[PDB]
Amino acid sequence: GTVNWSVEDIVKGINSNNLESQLQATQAARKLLSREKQPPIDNIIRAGLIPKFVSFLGKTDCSPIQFESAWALTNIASGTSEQTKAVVDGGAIPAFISLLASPHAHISEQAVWALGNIAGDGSAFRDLVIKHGAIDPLLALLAVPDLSTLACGYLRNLTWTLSNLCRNKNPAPPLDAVEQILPTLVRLLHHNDPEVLADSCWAISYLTDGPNERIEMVVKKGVVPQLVKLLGATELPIVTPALRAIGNIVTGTDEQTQKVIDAGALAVFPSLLTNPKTNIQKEATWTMSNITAGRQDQIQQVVNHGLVPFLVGVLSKADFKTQKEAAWAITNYTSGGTVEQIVYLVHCGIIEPLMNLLSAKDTKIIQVILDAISNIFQAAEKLGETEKLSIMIEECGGLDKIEALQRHENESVYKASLNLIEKYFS
Numbered sequence: 507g508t509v510n511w512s513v514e515d516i517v518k519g520i521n522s523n524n525l526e527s528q529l530q531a532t533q534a535a536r537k538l539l540s541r542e543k544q545p546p547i548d549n550i551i552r553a554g555l556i557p558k559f560v561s562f563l564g565k566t567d568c569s570p571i572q573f574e575s576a577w578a579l580t581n582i583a584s585g586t587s588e589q590t591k592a593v594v595d596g597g598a599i600p601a602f603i604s605l606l607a608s609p610h611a612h613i614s615e616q617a618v619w620a621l622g623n624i625a626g627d628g629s630a631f632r633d634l635v636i637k638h639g640a641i642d643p644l645l646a647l648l649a650v651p652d653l654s655t656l657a658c659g660y661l662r663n664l665t666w667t668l669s670n671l672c673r674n675k676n677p678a679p680p681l682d683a684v685e686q687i688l689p690t691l692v693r694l695l696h697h698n699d700p701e702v703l704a705d706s707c708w709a710i711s712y713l714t715d716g717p718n719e720r721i722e723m724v725v726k727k728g729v730v731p732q733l734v735k736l737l738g739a740t741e742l743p744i745v746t747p748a749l750r751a752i753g754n755i756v757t758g759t760d761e762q763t764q765k766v767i768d769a770g771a772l773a774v775f776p777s778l779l780t781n782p783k784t785n786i787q788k789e790a791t792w793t794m795s796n797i798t799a800g801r802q803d804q805i806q807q808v809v810n811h812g813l814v815p816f817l818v819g820v821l822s823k824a825d826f827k828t829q830k831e832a833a834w835a836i837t838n839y840t841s842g843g844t845v846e847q848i849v850y851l852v853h854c855g856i857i858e859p860l861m862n863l864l865s866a867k868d869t870k871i872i873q874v875i876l877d878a879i880s881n882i883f884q885a886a887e888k889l890g891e892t893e894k895l896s897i898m899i900e901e902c903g904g905l906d907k908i909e910a911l912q913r914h915e916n917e918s919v920y921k922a923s924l925n926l927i928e929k930y931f932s
């Protein structure tokens with residue numbers, strides 16, 4: 507019936523002076539826009555149909571045409587930024603917000619989905635959705651005593667949309683909107699459905715991706731223990747944003763970082779640092795590099811949790827981007843650690859994999875590694891053991907790699923390797 511219409515026939519029907527004819531053609535548009543291979547969005551837009559769809563959103567007397575036009579606009583707003591913009595320019599934002607409280611659940615769900623698509627386009631439209639007042643009615647849809655009585659797709663829909671209201675930067679979302687949304691996010695983070703949990707963790711990762719004041723308003727809600735729990739989930743779609751969020755938080759203050767350690771996060775890291783998914787192992791090592799940039803008593807907890815051999819592990823064999831993160835973790839460790847903490851690091855076998863990485867062509871890692879070697883030599887200086895260190899480095903073939911760094915030229919690299927060869931190695 508309404509299958510595979512041309513855009514011309516859709517236009518003929520929608521332009522008619524007959525509500526049923528308009529409904530039939532709007533449904534035909536919805537089906538065109540719902541096909542998987544190349545839905546003709548630009549053709550629909552060029553025909554001038556967006557304003558008609560938007561006016562149909564307000565037809566309270568005809569809920570099927572509200573539903574059909576809502577679904578059509580949702581699929582257009584899902585497209586390119588230019589196409590999302592056409593939807594906004596047609597006036598759809600307040601028309602959708604008015605539909606959030608519809609007695610028909612399928613229409614309210616459309617409005618949630620479409621507003622998520624619009625907010626999901628970027629910072630300006632996110633902020634414009636907030637200004638038109640979407641947050642209060644969005645949160646009101648979740649005001650039940652037990653989230654478990656809501657339909658599954660329905661709850662995942664609202665969670666996805668809320669996380670888009672948290673998502674982008676330059677600027678980050680308004681402080682007031684964040685504070686308004688956070689309590690609901692905390693509740694969702696405790697819901698038993700893997701998609702809601704994943705989406706909730708993504709939202710938290712967005713909110714922690716900024717300056718320390720932003721991280722603080724999240725940590726103040728008490729979510730770090732729950733995030734650490736999700737960090738140990740079996741589902742990779744949960745683990746990935748939980749680790750992102752956790753990694754964002756330890757970019758903050760030493761006190762914010764200590765909350766992560768206090769919650770038991772370090773115990774999960776033997777698994778994460780050997781995880782078969784490359785990006786999980788990369789972000790775990792990145793996370794370690796920021797914990798080793800903390801206080802000496804925080805470095806010490808890394809020691810007590812047995813994590814230094816795992817750092818030697820990743821430095822020895824990992825994807826190259828992961829190894830670079832491990833190199834950073836080692837330079838931070840040696841820059842902040844005690845003499846004794848540095849000696850332990852050498853006892854675990856850090857020198858050889860460190861030296862082997864001087865063969866890498868990436869200039870910035872070579873800098874980082876040379877810095878680390880310097881910090882370790884300063885430890886041997888206080889113990890009067892520079893010579894034993896030089897012998898270790900020489901025998902594993904490190905000296906040749908440092909020698910060769912001089913024919914290499916970066917102003918700092920060529921330099922740093924000189925100093926080392928003059929100061930030690932006679």
Ligand SMILES: CC(=O)N[C@H](CCCCN)C(=O)N[C@@H](CN[C@H](C(=O)N[C@H](Cc1ccccc1)C(N)=O)[C@H](C)O)COCc1cccnc1
Nearest residue numbers: 580581584585586587590615616619622623626627663666
């Ligand atoms: C971060 C983000 O959301 N990014 C973009 C938004 C585009 C902006 C570009 N300028 C995005 O991927 N959006 C949506 C697009 N929905 C498209 C769509 O057709 N959705 C329809 C709409 C719908 C909704 C409710 C009931 C029935 C139908 C669907 N669920 O069948 C998909 C890909 O077909 C895929 O679904 C994601 C989503 C959005 C809102 C709520 N839940 C899920």
Ligand SMILES: CC(=O)N[C@H](CCCCN)C(=O)N[C@@H](CN[C@H](C(=O)N[C@H](Cc1ccccc1)C(N)=O)[C@H](C)O)COCc1cccnc1
Nearest residue numbers: 714715716717754756757758759763796799800831834838
């Ligand atoms: C040694 C030191 O001073 N570290 C401080 C944090 C100390 C917190 C103590 N608890 C530091 O800046 N550590 C890392 C984190 N870099 C951050 C970073 O990479 N952020 C983004 C995400 C982000 C952005 C803003 C805040 C929080 C998180 C990312 N995932 O790429 C921002 C861009 O600076 C950057 O430096 C390590 C590094 C450099 C290059 C490559 N890998 C790791």
